[PDB]
Every structure is written in C-alpha cells, then in structure tokens.
Amino acid sequence: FFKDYQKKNVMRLLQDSLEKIINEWLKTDDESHTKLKSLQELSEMDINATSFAEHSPLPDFVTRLWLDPHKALDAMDKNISKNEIRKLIKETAREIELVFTHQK
Amino acid sequence: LESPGFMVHKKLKSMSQSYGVMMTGVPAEVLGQMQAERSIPSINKTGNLKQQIAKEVSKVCHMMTEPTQSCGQASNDVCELLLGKIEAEKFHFTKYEALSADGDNLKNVLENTAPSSTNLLIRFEIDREDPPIVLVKTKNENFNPETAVKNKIYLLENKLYFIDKMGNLFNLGPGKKKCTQLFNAIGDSAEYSLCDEPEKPEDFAISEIVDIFNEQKERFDFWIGSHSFTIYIPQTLGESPRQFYPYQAYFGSHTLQDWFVSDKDEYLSRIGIDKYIEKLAVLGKTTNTKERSDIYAEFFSKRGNEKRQPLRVKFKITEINPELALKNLQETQEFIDTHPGENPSDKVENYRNRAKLAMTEHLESLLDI
Ligand SMILES: [Pr+3]
Ligand SMILES: [Pr+3]
Ligand SMILES: [Pr+3]
Ligand SMILES: [Pr+3]
C-alpha cells in the first residue's frame, strides 16, 4: 500500500509546484500572449519528443523536468517513469491554461 | 475494549497530530528539492546567491507550521488511508449526492446500517456560487460580445446582456423600452456593483437589474468548489451510542494536524450525528447571511470571508474495512519510523532538518556552487 500512496503524494506535490511556478511565470506575459500560447503548445506536445525549440519561453524547471526528470529531481524514486512525468506536465499545462482563461 | 473500526480513528488522529506532513509519505529529500524549485524563480542570479539561497531556505523555515495544506489533500489522504488505492479510486469516481434540505436522505441511509458491524466514511463537497459582481454600462457602438470582460452584466440601450466566465452570451429579457429606462437612469461611471435601502433613481435601476438577473439564476451555473471534508462513523461496542468524527484541513486556517491538536474533531462529535446533518442542511437552505456564517464558522473553522452567496452540500458514502485501514496506517508509520528520533517530535525535527539540507543542496546545484 505505502509505495502507491507515496508515489501519489509525490506526484501531487510536483503538480502543485508546477502550478505555482507556471502561474507566477504566466503573471508576466505580454499582451501578445506569448507565454500562454507556449503553454498551450506544451499541453499538446508529443510525449516522445526529446527536444524543445531553442529559445523556448517555458520555465526552466518544466523543460528540465521533461527532458531528464530523474536528474531534475534526483530524490524522486525510479517507480516514477519519464512518460508519467511528461503526461503530468501536459495535464497540468492543460488545466492551468483553461483555468487561466476561465473555462474551468 | 474498543472496536477495530474505532481504532482506525485513533491511529489516524494520533499519526496526524504527531507527524503532520510526514503522513503524506513524501520523502523529506523530495520535499526540500521541490521547495527549492518553487523558490528559484524569486532568486535574482545577478545578485548575491548565498544571500538569497540562505534567505529562501530560511523563509520556507517559518512556513512549515503555517496552514499551507488544502482541504482536498487532507480529504484525499483520509480516503486513501482508510480505503487503499483500489477502493479510493472507485470512491473518487462515485457520484456525489445532493443533501436534502433537512438531510432526510443522508439521515435515512445511515439508519439502514448496523452501527455495530458497519464503518462509514462520508466525504462532502461544499460549493459556493460566484454570480457577477459588476454591472457595466456601455453603448452598442462600444460593445462587442466577444471582446468584453467576462462574468459581468452589460446594460445596453436595446439589450441587457450577461456574459458568463466561459463566453456564452445571455439575453436577460428586458425589452428595448425597459433598457432605455435603465440606461438613462444610471450615471456616467464605467462600472457599478451588484452588491451593496435605495434612495436615488440610480439605485432603483441597479436594484431592479439585480432582480431581473436573480429571477433567472436558474439558467446559469456559477457554482465553484469551496470546501472539502470527511466524516467517519466507526463501529460501536454493543449498546454504545453512535459517534461520527469530522476530518478537515483549511488552507489559510489550519492543517489536518492542527485540526486534531485542537480536538475540534471531538468537539463536533459530541453534538451528535443527526444534529450535525441538520445544521448542515440549514447551511444549504438559509438565505440569512449571519446564520450561514454562524454555521460555517462553527463547523469549518479553526478552534482558537462572510459567506454572503448561498452554499450547497453534497456527499458520497462508503464502507471501511478497519483491518485494511490499520494495515495501511502501519505501513505509513513504518515509513515514519525510518527517521531517527527518540519520540515523534524528534522524528519531525529530523524530517525538517533532512528536508532543509535537500532544499539547500538543490538550490546550490542549480545556481553553480
Ligand atoms: Pr494548438
Ligand atoms: Pr488543440
Ligand atoms: Pr535525539
Ligand atoms: Pr532533538
């Protein structure tokens, strides 16, 4: 029981940290919605994609977490897969932006 | 002699009161590393880094005891612990039932249970409605319904529109004669409030628009998730009376730990289960704001933000296996007891010091030290 419960709460704390960091970063978007449009692209990103565009607006943590999640957070257990991290990044990005633009 | 279903509340309350955030299962190393991540945007790396790293690490210090836990995480931890992963998943997808005005449904369904061989976990969501605050007076020549700000009422000369937060345009009904009566009745300020005894024809024009809106509240959905909590009614021994225990955190007010430390769980239990459902129903029925704030504070506030717009109560219920729940809590205390410490406070201090070392090291690896 405990490992599944711990993985859940570890994944939840990550999502919470993603939401807080992305939101602080979204609070300083211009009137051209550059950062928000970047966030929209991220929620549709191919999960096999192993490379971001060179001058990507995305926050450093998000892209580091996507590329090598176990180097980004070297205390995270191996039972969290790179695919699971990446699915979470897209589901968080999709939820934040829809909330940010007030559809939820 | 105490029933196993009751030992579940005992262990759960005892573990949360003693260990707090450690009960999530999160390794201290994971938690410090993360805190470093949500604190590294605030670090200007053209300034002094060891300045800011030590400052940031120290700011997260005086926050650990601060209420930064949400009601959903506490409610989720409780369901997960008493149900295990599989049944908490199915419980998470179970549909909420709306409480009756007098709580007849929840009252009655509890009566269909043997209080000596059944152990109920009840999870509640409280929803507030968020109607528009602002009435905007504008002309047709200045109003594109796609451009306009959302969650507002817009008074035109020939229409009276409501634009919800999603984008859907709504015609509130007043004919084109009525709209000009209101337009010429209201002043030149760009915005106006839909919440504040009228005296000026401006105030009557605003109050009737509030009325014209409120008679068609049916057509909309302003409701947002407001608060979450759980209730546990374990088994009783023989002729013992039934007892319930509420569990909750409240972001900004208290943690699940604080809730237990203050024994508010035990305070609310003594008012009995049925009298609780009753005051819970009035919260969903009342239109008096002082009464709605009286109950809401008594039920869901710290032991030691006026609820103006209505609240509604919904619930879903399930049965606990106390053997499973104790086994789940055992595995959790096994994790807790891997932290060096003579006593619980000593083990919490080890968690914090261990986490602070991970937050500091993760800050240093990211800022080239
Ligand atoms: Pr697209
Ligand atoms: Pr699309
Ligand atoms: Pr010691
Ligand atoms: Pr000590």
Author numbering:
A (entry chain C): 11 to 114
B (entry chain A): 13 to 208, 214 to 321, 331 to 395
Authors' description from the paper:
The genomic cluster of MavC encodes three effector proteins: Lpg2147 (MavC itself), Lpg2148 (MavC paralog A, or MvcA), and Lpg2149. Taken together, our data show that MavC can catalyze deamidation, ubiquitination, and deubiquitination by using the same active pocket. In addition to MavC and MvcA, the same genomic cluster in L. pneumophila also encodes a small effector protein, Lpg2149, which has been shown to interact with both enzymes and inhibit their deamidation activities.
The inhibitory role of Lpg2149 in the MavC system is reminiscent of the function of SidJ in the SidE system, although their operation mechanisms are distinct from each other. To understand the detailed molecular mechanisms of Lpg2149-mediated inhibition, we determined the crystal structures of MavC–Lpg2149 and MvcA–Lpg2149 complexes (X-ray statistics in Table 1). Both structures adopt a similar assembly, with the Lpg2149 monomer binding to the connecting region between Catalytic and HBD domains. Lpg2149 forms similar and extensive hydrogen bonding and hydrophobic interactions with MavC and MvcA, which are mainly mediated by the N-terminal α-helix (aa 11–37) and a helix-loop motif (aa 74–86) of Lpg2149. Upon binding to the enzymes, this C-terminal α-helix folds back and occupies the groove of the very same Lpg2149 molecule. Structural superimpositions between Lpg2149 in its apo and enzyme-bound states show that MavC and MvcA will form heavy steric clashes with the dimeric Lpg2149, thus providing a structural explanation of this dimer-to-monomer conformational transition. However, MvcA undergoes a considerable conformational change by enlarging the relative angle between Catalytic and HBD domains to accommodate Lpg2149, indicating an induced-fit model for MvcA. On the other hand, the same set of Lpg2149 mutants show considerable reductions for the inhibition of MvcA-mediated Ub deamidation.
